[PDB]
Amino acid sequence: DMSILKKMKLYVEDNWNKCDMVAISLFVVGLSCRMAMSTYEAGRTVLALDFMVFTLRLIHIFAIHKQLGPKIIIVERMIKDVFFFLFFLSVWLIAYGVTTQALLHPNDPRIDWVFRRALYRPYLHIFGQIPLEEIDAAKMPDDNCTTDVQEIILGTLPPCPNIYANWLVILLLVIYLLVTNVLLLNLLIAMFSYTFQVVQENADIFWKFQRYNLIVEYHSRPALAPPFIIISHITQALLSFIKDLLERELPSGLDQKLMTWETVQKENYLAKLEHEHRESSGERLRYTSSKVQTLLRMVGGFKDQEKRM
Amino acid sequence: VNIKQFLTYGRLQELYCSVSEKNLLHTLLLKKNQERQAQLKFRFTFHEVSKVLKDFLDDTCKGFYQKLNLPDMDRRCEHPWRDLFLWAILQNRQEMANYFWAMGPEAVAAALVGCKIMKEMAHLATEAESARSMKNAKYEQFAMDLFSECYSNSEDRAYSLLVRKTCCWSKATVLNIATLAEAKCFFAHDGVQALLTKVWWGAMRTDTSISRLVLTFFIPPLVWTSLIKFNPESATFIRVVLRRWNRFWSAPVTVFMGNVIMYFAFLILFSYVLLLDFRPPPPYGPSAAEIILYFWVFTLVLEEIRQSFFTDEDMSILKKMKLYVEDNWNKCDMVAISLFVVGLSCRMAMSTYEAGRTVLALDFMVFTLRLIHIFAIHKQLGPKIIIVERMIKDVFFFLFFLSVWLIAYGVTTQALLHPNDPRIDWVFRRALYRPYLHIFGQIPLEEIDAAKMPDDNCTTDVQEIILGTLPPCPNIYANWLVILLLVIYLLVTNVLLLNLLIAMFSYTFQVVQENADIFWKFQRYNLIVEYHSRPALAPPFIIISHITQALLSFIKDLLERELPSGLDQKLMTWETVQKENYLAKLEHEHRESSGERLRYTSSKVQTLLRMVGGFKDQEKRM
Ligand SMILES: C[C@@H]1CC[C@@]2(OC1)O[C@H]1C[C@H]3[C@@H]4CC=C5C[C@@H](OCC[C@H](CO)CO[C@@H]6O[C@H](CO)[C@@H](O[C@H]7O[C@H](CO)[C@@H](O)[C@H](O)[C@H]7O)[C@H](O)[C@H]6O)CC[C@]5(C)[C@H]4CC[C@]3(C)[C@H]1[C@@H]2C
Ligand SMILES: C[C@@H]1CC[C@@]2(OC1)O[C@H]1C[C@H]3[C@@H]4CC=C5C[C@@H](OCC[C@H](CO)CO[C@@H]6O[C@H](CO)[C@@H](O[C@H]7O[C@H](CO)[C@@H](O)[C@H](O)[C@H]7O)[C@H](O)[C@H]6O)CC[C@]5(C)[C@H]4CC[C@]3(C)[C@H]1[C@@H]2C
Ligand SMILES: C[C@@H]1CC[C@@]2(OC1)O[C@H]1C[C@H]3[C@@H]4CC=C5C[C@@H](O)CC[C@]5(C)[C@H]4CC[C@]3(C)[C@H]1[C@@H]2C
Ligand SMILES: C[C@@H]1CC[C@@]2(OC1)O[C@H]1C[C@H]3[C@@H]4CC=C5C[C@@H](O)CC[C@]5(C)[C@H]4CC[C@]3(C)[C@H]1[C@@H]2C
Ligand SMILES: *[C@@H]1O[C@H](CO)[C@@H](O)[C@H](O)[C@H]1NC(C)=O
Ligand SMILES: *[C@@H]1O[C@H](CO)[C@@H](O)[C@H](O)[C@H]1NC(C)=O
């Protein structure tokens, strides 16, 4: 008993369910395009992407593992620092790449190659891919290059790089390499270290809380793994047409006994708290001070009476 | 003793003249007195204390004692507790200053003024003990605690208390005094941040999701729907829809995001002009998009100038220029505009066309860097900006170490490998450029290892080497030493220095993050204050708003508001009551402390011992 729309909303709420929906949609689209001949290659491409989606689903499958689940939670938390580093790197990379593309190839109309030399190459500079053959004049090859735009567009010859102020290009490359490959990367390492230290303890508790739900799900899951699971599904459907260790209901006597036992344990726990409060140092100090004040006034009266005699 | 009747102005000046002569206040008063005598009954006149207060605050203590120039010497002070607190504060007497603050009418402003004056005198302090006491004035702590009490009490009168114009401190807003004091911890308080968030979202509700706001921004008509909830409070209907439109588009957050979107449009247009639509000199004419870009930047500079200079009605032009050039990001802005002007000028010519293109290429980088300062206000990004700004120092330390090691290794290898290359450019190349690239996995062994050196056509003659006919042959006399030095350099640089820098960044992050958050909040206050007066139209449109403002000025605030006399007095009495409650709570917590109870018990036990001993002696006598 639950609303169908509410169930759909609850399902689509989870991100891993969104990944599952993406996977099944890609499978359907790839199969449909594969069935045709004019869209065969597109279907193959979509299925290739779907394999990646399923292999990623494998992580959510392993989420219940006792040693791996907290790591999944930790990575899910690290995503935020990843995004911060992405913002910084994106700003710096846009700047450096567009500036170098303007300084080096100011007469290349090809939009694809503009975007290439502006963003793809500076991005690969991070991972040790620094092709100086296109950036340093002393290292630029004596290849057959053209300056004419027409010939450049047709792709007859590669466009010659501008070497007007190449010292500026090399200086900018040096500064970009420093900033990106040192400051940003080591800053991200520090951010991950701090985030790990602050998050791990909460990640363990969250893993336990999620483990409860995963075990609850595994309770009703049929014992047959897919693709066999169809036998169990058919059996369940046939049984439903023809016709739990957790969340059990107990007899009245046992239920009342457990309720009284809970009440007794609660009384014991409250008595222990109160006793520990009475024996606390602060409470003892307060009691001693109050009783000393009372004793002072009373013994002062007694001493006055004694002096009267 | 009735302080109101006790403290006359003559008595106040008598107190000021009777300084200890061994503290900082006496030295400052002597300096002011000598300056006044050079510019030309009582050792010091109210002019000297007024000038000292002018040095310390420069805006608040105006007319405190100059208004009447001296007032009647027998006339009682209008604000006795304020003057007493100020007097006790100028001379580092903190216990007395505290007592006077506990009696003053406006306590938050007084505490902020006190902390400002203390941190101002901390620099001028001669003795180390006095400076240490001044740095621990904890007067900002008093303001934070009292405002926490006030915020817990009402949370609606607290905002009015923050934004009201105080009567004692020359119509100065409490937030204005906190800004003057640079009380960063005060701005970090949850109440001040909540008020700033309320200002940030304008008429909209602060809980509005960012995605809904962006979607409503991109599709304007959805403002009239119920997608975003608003805070409460033919001709009528038009007025209603216009009011809703204005209440949405006047919010500071919408103005900020519009500015960000149009700055992204600027970066896109600048890149397009620089990469695809950069035409020959004006003989063939700059592109129309280039003219649009020039107009764009003109509007941006107009907005910058207006924000920096025309926001303040009364302030020295030279002082405003100094304040503007003080900020580093303003220096970056000046560099950007100067580069734009130089690049445009060189582009207008034909003999300097390429230089102009190069300068504009650099300017694009400068503007894309300006984008970070634009995003500084973001709730999740700003602290990261602060953290990076702090990391710069460790970057410099690593740079020093790397520079020393790199100079050594590079010059040694250039001497060992190419001892007969006269070309200065290639000497500097092989000495510094190549060892620098060794850090990033660029190790060209084809020029360093003889077993890997190519059978290319090389010359040994210097003449031929200089002319560039053939590349100079590398020396292979002792190449085992070159390879050993390369190995040692690779080890040191790529392992020790890099992992040391990683450790330095880790430690710096851990130590800095908490202060960076508070500094972000303190800066967020000023950014929201700036967004208050910023016109709601993002550039290049902003020119319409500028023209409208100029026309309105020729023809003719939620923060820092002034309240009616009755409400002002009510809030002052409420502040006094909250201060009394806070002090009573502190005193009660002090009485119930374990140490105080132990002291009381010990003293009373001693008294009881002696008294009961006397009683026992009396009993034994019977
Ligand atoms: C510790 C810290 C590290 C980072 C840094 O600061 C210090 O290091 C600094 C070092 C510096 C660099 C030091 C040196 C230079 C060189 C200088 O050019 C000199 C001007 C001349 C005039 O155009 C250029 O020369 C000639 O160009 C020609 C290109 O047409 C070459 O023709 C080639 O044609 C064909 C190529 O296919 C082949 O026949 C041959 O290959 C060759 O014949 C010549 O061979 C070559 O002679 C430009 C500046 C630069 C790169 C410095 C930049 C800044 C640094 C990296 C510093 C860092 C901040
Ligand atoms: C764990 C730790 C790591 C770091 C380290 O310590 C341990 O490792 C050690 C290893 C060691 C190195 C071990 C070995 C050597 C070799 C030694 O040369 C032997 C002397 C002879 C005499 O000149 C040189 O040989 C010959 O040179 C000729 C150059 O004219 C080559 O001609 C080439 O000509 C043309 C090239 O275009 C082509 O025809 C062919 O390419 C080739 O014919 C010959 O082929 C080659 O036979 C020099 C020292 C060196 C590099 C050691 C240095 C120190 C280490 C890195 C240690 C670390 C601390
Ligand atoms: C991470 C972002 C995604 C979006 C984007 O920038 C990076 O991707 C880039 C890829 C570019 C493509 C790459 C190749 C070609 C082919 C060429 O004949 C015509 C131009 C066109 C379509 C380009 C148009 C602009 C595009 C989408 C860029 C776009 C801002
Ligand atoms: C980070 C520092 C900046 C300053 C500096 O060292 C690194 O830059 C280096 C670049 C060098 C240039 C590079 C190219 C040439 C061209 C050549 O035909 C004549 C010599 C000259 C001008 C060189 C002179 C010495 C220079 C400025 C070096 C200078 C100490
Ligand atoms: C470049 O193209 C020209 C066309 O005539 C040809 O003569 C020359 O040999 C080519 N050079 C190279 C390096 O391919
Ligand atoms: C080097 O130059 C000489 C000049 O005569 C030439 O004979 C020889 O073939 C050249 N070798 C190479 C590898 O270019």
Side-chain angles (χ1 to χ4, degrees), chain B residues 475-513:
Chain B
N475 183 33
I476 61 179
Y477 173 55
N479 201 0
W480 60 268
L481 189 45
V482 178
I483 291 147
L484 178 58
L485 288 181
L486 165 75
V487 160
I488 297 173
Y489 169 81
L490 278 185
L491 174 64
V492 167
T493 296
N494 278 43
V495 164
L496 176 136
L497 284 190
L498 287 192
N499 303 345
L500 178 74
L501 187 45
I502 298 178
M504 293 204 252
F505 287 168
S506 287
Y507 174 81
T508 300
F509 197 87
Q510 290 181 356
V511 189
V512 170
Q513 188 168 0

Side-chain angles (χ1 to χ4, degrees), chain B residues 50 53-54 57 60-65 86 113 117 169-170:
Chain B
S50 293
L53 295 169
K54 181 67 64 66
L57 304 178
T60 303
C61 304
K62 183 179 80 77
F64 271 10
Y65 320 111
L86 227 38
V113 163
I117 294 178
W169 301 100
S170 315

Side-chain angles (χ1 to χ4, degrees), chain B residues 384-423:
Chain B
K384 306 310 165 199
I385 317 296
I386 309 299
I387 285 161
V388 172
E389 283 161 12
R390 305 300 167 77
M391 295 296 172
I392 298 306
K393 200 84 142 162
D394 291 331
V395 175
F396 281 145
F397 293 133
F398 155 84
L399 272 185
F400 162 78
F401 278 110
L402 173 70
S403 163
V404 160
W405 187 252
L406 193 142
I407 292 283
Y409 162 81
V411 173
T412 297
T413 42
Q414 158 74 16
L416 276 180
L417 198 58
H418 296 267
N420 61 323
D421 192 291
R423 301 195 301 264

Side-chain angles (χ1 to χ4, degrees), chain A residues 63-66 69-70 73 203-211:
Chain A
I64 188 60
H65 198 262
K66 180 155 94 263
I73 309 299
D204 186 74
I205 292 170
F206 193 95
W207 173 77
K208 293 161 177 296
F209 167 68
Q210 187 199 25
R211 171 199 194 193

Side-chain angles (χ1 to χ4, degrees), chain A residues 137-138 140 163 167 170-171 174, chain B residues 406 425-426 428-429 432 436:
Chain A
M140 260 148 187
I163 61 179
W167 60 268
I170 291 147
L171 177 58
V174 160
Chain B
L406 193 142
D425 50 308
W426 273 95
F428 274 96
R429 275 177 167 275
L432 307 166
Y436 179 80

Side-chain angles (χ1 to χ4, degrees), chain A residues 99 136 164 174 178 194 197, chain B residues 354 361 429 433 436 510 513:
Chain A
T99 297
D136 198 348
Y164 173 55
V174 160
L178 174 64
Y194 174 81
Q197 290 181 356
Chain B
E354 293 176 352
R429 275 177 167 275
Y433 180 43
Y436 179 80
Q510 290 181 356
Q513 188 168 0

Side-chain angles (χ1 to χ4, degrees), chain A residues 104-132 134-141 144-147:
Chain A
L104 198 58
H105 296 267
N107 61 323
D108 192 291
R110 301 195 301 264
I111 319 293
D112 50 308
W113 273 95
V114 174
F115 274 96
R116 275 177 167 275
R117 311 198 204 91
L119 307 166
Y120 180 43
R121 207 169 61 195
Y123 179 80
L124 295 176
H125 283 351
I126 307 165
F127 312 101
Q129 293 292 301
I130 306 155
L132 301 170
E134 290 95 2
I135 297 143
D136 198 348
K139 301 187 173 46
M140 260 148 187
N144 235 6
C145 283
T146 169
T147 59

Side-chain angles (χ1 to χ4, degrees), chain A residues 140-141 144-147 149 152-208:
Chain A
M140 260 148 187
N144 235 6
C145 283
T146 169
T147 59
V149 161
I152 277 172
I153 294 190
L154 294 176
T156 315
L157 285 169
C160 180
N162 183 33
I163 61 179
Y164 173 55
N166 201 0
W167 60 268
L168 189 45
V169 178
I170 291 147
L171 177 58
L172 288 181
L173 165 75
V174 160
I175 297 173
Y176 169 81
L177 278 185
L178 174 64
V179 166
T180 296
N181 278 43
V182 164
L183 176 136
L184 284 190
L185 287 192
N186 303 345
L187 178 74
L188 187 45
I189 298 178
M191 293 204 252
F192 287 168
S193 287
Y194 174 81
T195 300
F196 198 87
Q197 290 181 356
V198 189
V199 170
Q200 189 168 0
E201 63 272 15
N202 291 319
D204 186 74
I205 292 170
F206 193 95
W207 173 77
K208 293 161 177 296

